[model samples]
Target: RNSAKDIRTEERARVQLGNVVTAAALHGGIRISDQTTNSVETVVGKGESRVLIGNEYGGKGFWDNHHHHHH
Candidate 1:
């Protein structure tokens, strides 16, 4: 009891998910399993400085721009 629209929607979801997994494997790194072994590789590492600055702390620069008025 499914419509054509439902089928297309499901197909789109599957395609999108596949694209995301491929991207993660290429860029963010992933642990993938083979028949008898597992391996990990990525362009960025979990504890690397660039990863920390970009993701955990939000980009490269932070500054305090607050000024106090002297009366």
Candidate 2:
């Protein structure tokens, strides 16, 4: 139990403390701008992902932080 050396895909290590948290988080990695123009926003570091919308399209809110390691 020292290293916990399970050889779990040894490479880059990124840890997070909380949810994606906001629409900007669910979109791009949260660069704060209250009035973003109506346009195509691409989330880099995630293979050119994109997002453009209003809040909660049919109860599918992004409050659900369903990405990456957790307890």
Candidate 3:
């Protein structure tokens, strides 16, 4: 019923995932998001699943400095 434009990447998937879990708890179903865009779709109530949503929540979610070399 509601959707947005787009959003963050997958590195912050965990943080976003946590939020998704919360959403699932509320909707009583799993939440699905897109890697390209910040779109999300939730499963139907009990059986069906049809809802695509988009959002623009994060610009540069976090900072990870362990990828390169620690010198």
lDDT of each: 0.24, 0.32, 0.34
* Residue pairs that clash (backbone atoms under 3 angstroms), model 2: none
Q: Best candidate, lDDT-wise? A: 3
lDDT of 1 at 68: 59
In angstroms, how far off is 30's CA in candidate 1? 2.0
- Model 1 / residue 59 / CA error / Å: 14
lDDT tens digits, residue span 1-71, model 1: 11111112222232111111322234333443222322223323222122111111222233222465668
TM-score of 3: 0.17
Off by over 4 Å in 3: 14-71
Candidate 2 ranges with C-alpha deviation above 4 Å: 1-46, 61-69
Most TM-score-accurate candidate: 2
Worst 10 residues of 1 by lDDT: 48-57
| Per-residue alpha-carbon lDDT of candidate 3 for residues 8-40, written as tens digits (9 for 90 to 100) | 434323222222222223443334455454434
Give the TM-score ranking, best first: 2, 3, 1
